Design a protein around this ligand. Sequence first.
Ligand code: HEM
Ligand code: HEM
Ligand code: HEM
Ligand code: HEM
Lengths: 141, 141, 144, 144
Amino acid sequence: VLSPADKTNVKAAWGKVGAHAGEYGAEALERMFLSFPTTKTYFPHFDLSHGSAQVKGHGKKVADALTNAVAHVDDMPNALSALSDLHAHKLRVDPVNFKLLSHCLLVTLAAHLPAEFTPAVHASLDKFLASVSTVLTSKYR
Amino acid sequence: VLSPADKTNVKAAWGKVGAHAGEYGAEALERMFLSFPTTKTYFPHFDLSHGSAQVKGHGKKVADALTNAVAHVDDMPNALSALSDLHAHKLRVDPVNFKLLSHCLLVTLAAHLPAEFTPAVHASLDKFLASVSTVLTSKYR
Amino acid sequence: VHLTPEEKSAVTALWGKVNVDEVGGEALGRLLVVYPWTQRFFESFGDLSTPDAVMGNPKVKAHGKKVLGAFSDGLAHLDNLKGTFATLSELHCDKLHVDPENFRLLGNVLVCVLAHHFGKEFTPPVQAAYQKVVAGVANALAHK
Amino acid sequence: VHLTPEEKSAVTALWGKVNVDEVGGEALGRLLVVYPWTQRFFESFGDLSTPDAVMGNPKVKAHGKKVLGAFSDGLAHLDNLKGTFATLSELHCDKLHVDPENFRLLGNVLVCVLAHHFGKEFTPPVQAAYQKVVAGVANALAHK
Ligand code: HEM
Ligand code: HEM
Ligand code: HEM
Ligand code: HEM
């Protein structure tokens, strides 16, 4: 459960990303692929090479979904229902993987927004990502 | 996130608990303390012996809180706000402890209501307890 | 794992009543139902569409029997779980890439199944002994 | 933990540039802020009422250096982490009863602090090497 301050923190931080969305998204995936090789097993037919256009494209998609989540923070399950279907019902992604991507996203944000990545903001983002993860790993339809 | 059928399953199974809620909550605690001794660290002021009056009394409060959660399944955050404040803010209960109690709760129910404890109900209860756990471990007020 | 003689006796007495052709299938089925992502590992098993499909699946039951055989094996080698489960650890970790959290989950679902089948006999103290056993097994499997 | 020669160099080089006086306090502070149940173990540290209070607490900055010092010992003996953290394992498990999942959380928070500090220098490959170290340390602490 996010507090009012959490939502505000997330909106402020995420808002900074801007047109870098896809870039940060791609970087987060690459950090994941390198640090946690097992995750690659969910992308059997991908070109996962460094600077791959496939990963850049996917990074964009991931980032957009997060923007979507921020814009519907108070009613997430309805906004991301399509994504739950895919990850929970179709792909059946083990929840541990969401912790891995979440961590890689936090690392990406820390490396790019030094002034925004305060302890308080770090805390809010962690919670938000956990919230998103819960929705994508649930079957509530 | 709970699905419509999950909510139906919980209501139905908790309905069977009924007047036994208190003894079941007491048994769940006793089960947790014996099986996971580190949990006892949160109750240093308690007589944790078998049949302890304090445990009995305490199992009643827990079960009442769960009954209230079931009745407010679509609005847990608001209904459990005081409990959230106590466990997340004041007691600072490590989230792993909630998984332990939840497990002990499921064992108690399986033990007592074997006919009702079907795979589907088991899955619904697990999700419900995870949801309750999330609310109590969060600081959102 | 160290069990007091009292505990060993209790653990053993209950294990003696376990229906070996069934309990493992029940435990595995419930895992697939309660924690749905685990189905990803058993895509070859067929129809796992619903609890009914899962519980009635012939392959789940057959496999469940193999899982139970391993616990029985553990019960007999409590002082050497890591050596005993070496091969299984390698299989699950290195080849299947099962996250270690799932081993804990299967162990817990197994406890729920015993509780379900033995009700009154599955007392707190008996449960406490069984939790040590299943944590020991999960730990040996995650060794790799 | 086995790091390739390249990984070891990458790790040790970055480590020489870490402000030993401040990074530890930042990591510990963030743990307390981000996963607040962890504050329960540092009750004797004073005012952990707010992030600001946490971040500024002298006992937190002081303790932080101790923690980092432990990470350094690990780096110098990747060979024998278990042996190196034997005593610490004991303190944390036996006497403090800290859940092992919390060791992973701190290792991760340290990675975030490194990224925060080094910016673009903290590349994916550099991150990958560091993730092996923190997993190593976490496992060795949980050894007991
Ligand atoms: C914050 C967490 C995540 C978000 C927001 C997210 C978002 C998305 C989005 C937007 C898509 C594309 C769907 C479309 O084509 O419309 C997608 C696809 C996919 N995601 Fe994620 N995802 C997350 C976590 C994960 C994790 C942890 C994994 C596994 C390690 C994963 C594996 C995949 C796969 C395999 C696909 C499909 C690839 C394809 O065939 O195009 N996702 N995700
Ligand atoms: C299903 C999840 C839980 C529920 C519904 C629950 C419910 C409650 C309730 C209703 C109270 C007393 C409220 C009052 O009258 O002030 C309470 C107090 C308490 N709970 Fe829980 N609890 C849960 C999980 C836990 C866990 C996992 C732990 C730690 C192992 C824990 C430790 C405590 C402690 C230490 C107290 C204060 C007792 C006292 O000093 O009187 N609770 N809880
Ligand atoms: C306490 C935990 C577990 C025990 C004791 C156990 C035991 C076993 C045994 C005895 C086998 C047969 C290996 C052989 O062919 O000799 C096996 C295979 C297998 N297990 Fe498990 N297992 C456990 C947990 C899990 C979990 C949690 C998963 C996934 C969620 C899993 C997935 C598999 C798979 C995919 C196979 C291979 C199936 C095949 O042969 O096609 N296991 N396990
Ligand atoms: C990678 C993880 C960790 C490392 C390397 C580490 C290291 C250390 C060290 C070197 C000490 C000082 C012992 C002494 O010489 O007095 C210590 C003490 C302590 N640690 Fe940690 N620690 C870790 C994680 C944790 C976590 C996650 C917690 C709990 C949230 C924790 C709680 C404590 C406490 C309460 C003490 C107090 C001992 C005293 O009073 O000196 N530690 N730790």
